[PDB]
């Protein structure tokens, strides 16, 4: 009797991820009291209006 | 001399003689920019022989 095995495994798990997140905005105001100008022109991201 | 009426809101001001205008030209400009970037890379390799 005689016997012989050859056995092989090869595995490749590549992966990747990316994310680009960009936000911009520019309130602009003319007229009105400078305190109300600054208080409104500051961009509230939850209410850009 | 002076003593021309000059107002801002309810307050009245005496303009200096040297000054041609001091006037509440009121304006505001805001700028917001936000740039978030992510990348990641993963590489697993296995080799087995028997």
CA distance B24 to B7: 10
Smallest Cα–Cα separation from B26: which of A27, A39, A31, A40?
Answer: A31
The reply to whether B12 touches chain A by the CB within 8 Å rule is no
| Residues in A touching B41 (Cβ below 8 Å) | 15-16
CA distance B39 to B30: 30
What determination technique applies here? Answer: cryo-EM
Smallest Cα–Cα separation from A38: which of A29, A26, A47, A25?
Answer: A29
| Residues in B touching A12 (Cβ below 8 Å) | 43-46
CA distance B9 to B6: 10
Smallest Cα–Cα separation from B46: which of A13, A15, A16?
Answer: A13
Resolution value in angstroms: 3.3
The three state secondary structure string of A3-49 is CCCCCEEEEEEEEEEEEEEEEEECCEEECCCHHHHHHHHCCCCCCCC
The reply to whether B11 touches chain A by the CB within 8 Å rule is no
Question: CA–CA distance from B34 to each of A17, A41, B50 (Å)?
Answer: 20, 17, 54
Test B45 with A28 for CB contact under 8 angstroms.
Answer: no
| Overall residue count recorded for chain A in this entry | 49
Instruction: Judge contact between B6 and B14, C-beta under 8 A.
Output: yes
């Amino acid at each position: 009797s005689s016997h012989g095995c050859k056995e092989l495994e090869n595995a490749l798990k590549a992966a990747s991820g990316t994310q680009n997140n960009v936000l911009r905005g520019e309130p602009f105001i003319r007229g009105g009291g400078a305190g109300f100008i600054s208080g409104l022109s500051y961009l509230e991201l939850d209410n850009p209006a | 001399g002076g003593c021309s009426p000059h107002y801002i809101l309810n307050t009245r001001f005496r303009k200096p003689y040297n000054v041609e205008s001091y006037t509440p030209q009121t304006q505001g400009k805001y700028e917001f920019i936000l740039k978030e970037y992510e990348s990641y890379s993963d590489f697993e390799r296995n080799v087995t022989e028997k």
